Amino acid sequence: AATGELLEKSVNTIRFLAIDAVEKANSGHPGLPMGCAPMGHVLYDEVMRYNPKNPYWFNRDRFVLSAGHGCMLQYALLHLAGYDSVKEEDLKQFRQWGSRTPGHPENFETPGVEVTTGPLGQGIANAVGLALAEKHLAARFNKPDSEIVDHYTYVILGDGCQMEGIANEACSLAGHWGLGKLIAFYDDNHISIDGDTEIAFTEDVSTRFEALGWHTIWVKNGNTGYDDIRAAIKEAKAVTDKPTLIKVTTTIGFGSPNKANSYSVHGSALGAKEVEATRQNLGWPYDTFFVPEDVKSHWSRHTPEGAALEADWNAKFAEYEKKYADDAATLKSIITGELPTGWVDALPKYTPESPGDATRNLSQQCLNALANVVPGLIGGSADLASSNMTLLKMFGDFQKDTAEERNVRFGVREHGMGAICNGIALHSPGFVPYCATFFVFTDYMRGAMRISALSEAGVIYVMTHDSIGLGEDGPTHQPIEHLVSFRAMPNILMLRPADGNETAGAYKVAVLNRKRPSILALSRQKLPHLPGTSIEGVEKGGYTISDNSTGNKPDLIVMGTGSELEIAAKAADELRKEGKTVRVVSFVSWELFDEQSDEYKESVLPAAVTARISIEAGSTLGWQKYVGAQGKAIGIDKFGASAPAGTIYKEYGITVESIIAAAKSF
C-alpha cells in the first residue's frame, strides 16, 4: 500500500485527472471525485480483486458508482488501474461524441463499468442485485473443497441516492437477505444541488439503515482518515450476515479553496482561476492529465498482480470442472451465456383443441419449463406470486439461509425489483432474470426499465393484468397508455401474446435476447388457443394467422394483439360467411414486425389493401402506421372502469360488432 507523500500524490492524481477532464470538456462534476479520491484510491489500489486486462473475469469484485455524475472518479481509477477502455486520450475525450468516457457511466461503452448509472438510486439497487447474484452462485455451486464463487460488491452512493425511494426499497431487501458481501460507501458531504442537505434532508440515515438490517460504520474524516477507511472495510468483511453502510464524511470539492463545501463545485468546471488556486492549495505543480512517475510505477503492479489473481481462480475452476463436471457445466452456462443445446424444445406446445387459459397461467408453464434448461433463469414477483403466476414449482425461495433457491420474493418494491434484476443480468451474461407486477405498475419501476433498455440488460418483464380485462379493480389498475409508452421506448420488446403458442414464442424471443429487455403483457382472463398462432410467427412480430384471400388482395385486414386477437378472429369468421375475403394478423410485437424485410411486410400488409382494422384494449396511438390513411383503430383513449370485465368490453366497444361496423364504413 502507498504511504506518506506517494499516497498523497496518488490521491491528488485522481483529484486532478477529474478536475482537468471536466475543465477540458467545460462540462461535468468535479466535486464528488475531489471528495471521494481517498476512498476511491483505497478501493481500487488496496481492496478490490480484479484483472484490469480482463474486465469480464467471473470472480472479480464488482464496483458501482451509484452517484454516476461523479464518473470521473471511476474513469481516473480505471485509467490508473490499467483498463484498456480508459487510455489518457479517453480522459481527454470526456463527454465528447462517441467517447468511452460519457458524462455518466455506461457499461455498454466502457468495459470495466459494470452497470449504467446517472439516474440516482439505480446503482445502489444494482449493487443489491450483483450481491444477490454472488450469494446465489456461491450457495448453489461452492463445495466443501472448492470456494469457486467468492467476490464482494462495493458501491459509492451520495445524498441523492439516499433520498430516492428505489434505494430504500433495495436496501430493505439487502438487509432482509443478509447480503454480507455488499459494502456501500455513503459520501456524507452535506451537499446536493440545492446546497446544504439541511434544506430538505435531515433524517438519521445511519439509524434508518440499522432499521433495514444493515451493519453501520461512521468514518468521520473521509478526506484524510485512510486508516479509518481501511479499518471500516476490514470490519465490514468481518460482519458476514448483514450488508454494511460505511458513512464516509467528506468535503465535496476537497482542495478547492473557493468552491469546497458548496453546491458551486457539484456540477461545473472549476474554471481557469480556481483550477490554478486548487493546484497551488494542494501543491500540484504538474501539467494537465499528468500521472507522476512514482504514482505510475506504484499502480503498474495491478497488471501483473491482476493476471496472477485471475490465473489462481482459473486453476480453482479447472479443479472444480475435474471433480464436479455436471455442476461446472451448469455454472459455465451462467458464466459464458451459452444456453444449453435444445433448450427451446422444453417450451410447451398447444393446438386449438387445448383448453382455453389466461396467458398469465401459460406464462407460468413457460417459466417452469425454462427453469429446467436455462440455468441462469432466476426471479419473481413484487408480492403477486399467486396473481402474476411466477413461482418455479421445483424451487424454494431465495433467502439469507437458502440463497441457492431461484424464486426471488421482492415484496411491494417494483422499482427496486427492476434495478436488482438489472444487477443480476449484468453480473454474468448467462443470467436470465425475470420480474413481475401488474402491467399498470410498470409506471413505478419505469426508471429501471428504461435503464434495462439503455444498458442492454436482458431482463424479462412478466406483466399480467394487462387491460380492462382485469375488471373490478377499476381504472387505478387498468393499463391504457402502457403498451404504446413502451413501443416508443428504444431497445425494448413490447410482446402481447394471444394464447399458448404466442406465449411460448414470446418466451423463446425473451430468452434469446440477452442484450434487449422483453416485456410480456399477459391476461388475467382465460383466452382460447387460436388456429394459426406459432413461435415462428411471434419471431416476426406481425404475421397472418388466417386468410381466405387470393392474389395477396384480401377485401379486409383485421389486426389484433393479446386478448383482442380472438375478437378479430371471430369478426373475420362472420365477415367471411357474408362472402368477404379477410386476413387476420397478429401484432404480438410491433418492434419485431418493423425489423422484417419490405417483401415480408408486403406479404402481410399489401400496399393495395386499404381496408384495415386494428383492435387492442389500450391507446389507439401509433396504430395508424399499420391501418393506414383509410383504416380504423378500435381501442381505448380514456381511463377504465370498476366493473366485471365483460361489461367494460361491451361499454368500451371492444367487440366483434365494432369490427363489423368499421368494415361496413369503408
Next chain:
Amino acid sequence: AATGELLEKSVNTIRFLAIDAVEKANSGHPGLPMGCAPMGHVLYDEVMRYNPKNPYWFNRDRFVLSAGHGCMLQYALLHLAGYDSVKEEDLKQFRQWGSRTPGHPENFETPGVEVTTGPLGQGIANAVGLALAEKHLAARFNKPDSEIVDHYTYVILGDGCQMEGIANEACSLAGHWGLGKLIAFYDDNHISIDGDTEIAFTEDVSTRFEALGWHTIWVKNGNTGYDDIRAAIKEAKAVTDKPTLIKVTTTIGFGSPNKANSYSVHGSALGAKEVEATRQNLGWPYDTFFVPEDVKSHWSRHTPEGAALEADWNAKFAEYEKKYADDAATLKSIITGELPTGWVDALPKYTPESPGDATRNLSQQCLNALANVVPGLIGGSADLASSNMTLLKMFGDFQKDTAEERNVRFGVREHGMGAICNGIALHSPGFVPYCATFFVFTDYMRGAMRISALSEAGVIYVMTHDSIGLGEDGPTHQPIEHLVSFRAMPNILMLRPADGNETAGAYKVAVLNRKRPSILALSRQKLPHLPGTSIEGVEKGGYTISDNSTGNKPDLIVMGTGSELEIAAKAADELRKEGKTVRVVSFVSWELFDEQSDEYKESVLPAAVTARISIEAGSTLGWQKYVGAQGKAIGIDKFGASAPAGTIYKEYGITVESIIAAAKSF
C-alpha cells in the same frame, strides 16, 4: 362514544357491510376492513371533525385510505356517517359499472373520498401534501387571537405502502417539515398477498420512522384495544412538532374462523359457508347490508353535530374576515377556487425586440409573475431549483418554522413530490401546486402523474432539459419516448412551448386547468421568439404561426414543437424563397388540438394537402396522425449520446437540411 354491546355492534356493522358488499360483488377485499373496523370506528365516530352533509367544508379533518384495496372500510364509514354519496343502494353496487363504490377509492366518483388510492404508497404521500397544505395555510393566515386554520390529516396504510419507495420519500419530508398534525395508522397485520411478511419484509418499520423524524406509538391489540387506540390518537394529537406513526397490530379478516390471519382473506369474497361461519363466530344475526337501529341512532348524531361544527367555524371565519379583511379575502380565494380578476394580465408578453431565451428561464418569469396574482401557487423542484428555474424570488422556503413560505424544496424525491402535490391540489380548489425535475425523470414519478390525470388534480409539472438539447449529460438524461408516453395518457396536457409567448400560453392553460394536470416540456438551451406564436394559439394546441399559401392549399405544411419549431420556421423561409407556399404549424399541445372543431382542424391541416413534415427531438411514434402515410416525421427513435448538443442535432439529422430533403421527396 359507544360503550359495551353498542360499541361491539357498531364495529361489527362496519365488518359485515364490508363482508356483504364484497360477497354480493363476488370481488374485493374483506380482510383489511375486518381488521381495521376498530380504528375506523374510533376515527369516524369519535375523533374526526367533519360535516357529513358538506364534504367540502374547508376546516374538516382529512382521512386517506392509502391501502385503497380496503375501500369497503371507508364506504361503510361514509355510509354510517350520513354522506349523501354512499347510500345502501351504493353499497349494493360495489365494484359495479359506474357506481359511487368503485373497487379502489376515487375522489372523482365519491364525494367524501379526498384523493384516489389503490396504487400502494400514493395515499401516505398524499396525506403528507394535505398536512403541508394545512400547515402552510395555518402559518400564512393564523393570528395570535384567530386559529382559523386548524385540522388534522389521518391516514391508514398497510405493509404494501410501507415497502413502497414513494412512502419512505414522503415520510422523510414529513419528518423534516415537522408535520405534527399528520397522524398515520400502520395496519400491522403481518400479511400481504405473498402471505406472512417474513417472506420479504423484516425491517424495523417503527425505528425507520424514528430515524425519519417521526413520533411513534404501538397499539399491540388493535382488534379489541379500543381504549389503547383512543389513547394513542390523543397522544399523537398532543405531539405538535413531529408527525406520528401509530403502529396498530390487527388480525386481517378478524372474526373469520377459517380465513383470519392468512393471504386467503386479503383479496377475495369469504364465500357462502365462511360468511355464515363469520356471522356465527361474531354473533351477527342481521340480514345483509343491515345497520341495527341502535347503531343507526348512535351514528345519526353526526348530521346535527357536523352541521354545528361547520357553523361554529363559519362564525370564526366571519370574525377573521371582520378583523383581518385582506388576509380573509386571500384565504377565501384558496378555499373557493375563485382566481383573482385579471390574473392572466400578469403573464409576460414578447415581441421581435425581446432577446431569445431558454423556455426554462421563460418558465421562471411566468411562475414569478403568477405568484403575485395566484394566491394558491406553491411548489418547487426535486433538488434542481437553479437548473429547472423554479424559485419564486419574492418568497423564502417552506420549512417547519417558516411554513408560510411558498417555495417547496423536495430534495431528490420525484415520486414523493408528485403525490405530495396531488395532496396539495385536492386539499382546496384554489391551490395551484407546481413541481419540477428534468423531464427524463418523469419516469421515477409516473405513478403519481398518472393519478394526477385520473383524480383530476391540476398539478403543474415543470419539466426542463426536455431533449438531446441538454448535450453532455448523455442518454441517461435525454428524453426520447417521454412526449408520446404522455400524449397517450388520458387527461393530461403535454405542452411543449417554443418561446416566450408559447410559455405564457402554456401557463395560462395550466392555471385554468384545475381538473387536468399539465406537463410543460422546457428547454435547457436558448431559443428565439418566433413571429406568430400567441397565447390564443396555445389554447388551440395546434395552430398556424406563418403561411404564404392561398385557398387553404399550401404546397407544404411543416409542423414542430418546442426547440424544433425554429428549425421548421427556418426551413419554411428557405422553401418560400424558391416560390413554394409553406404553412408552419405549432403543435404545442396535441390534446388541445384534438379537442377543436372539424372546421378548425381542416383550417390548419387541410385534407387535400398530403405534403406534410413534422420535426421534434423525440420519438416519431404517433406523428402519422398529423403528417399522414405520405408525410414524413423527423425525430429520434433511438437513445441519445454524451456530446455537445449541437453535435447531437447534426448527427441525428434534426436539421433544416432534413426538412428540405423530405420536401424534395414528395
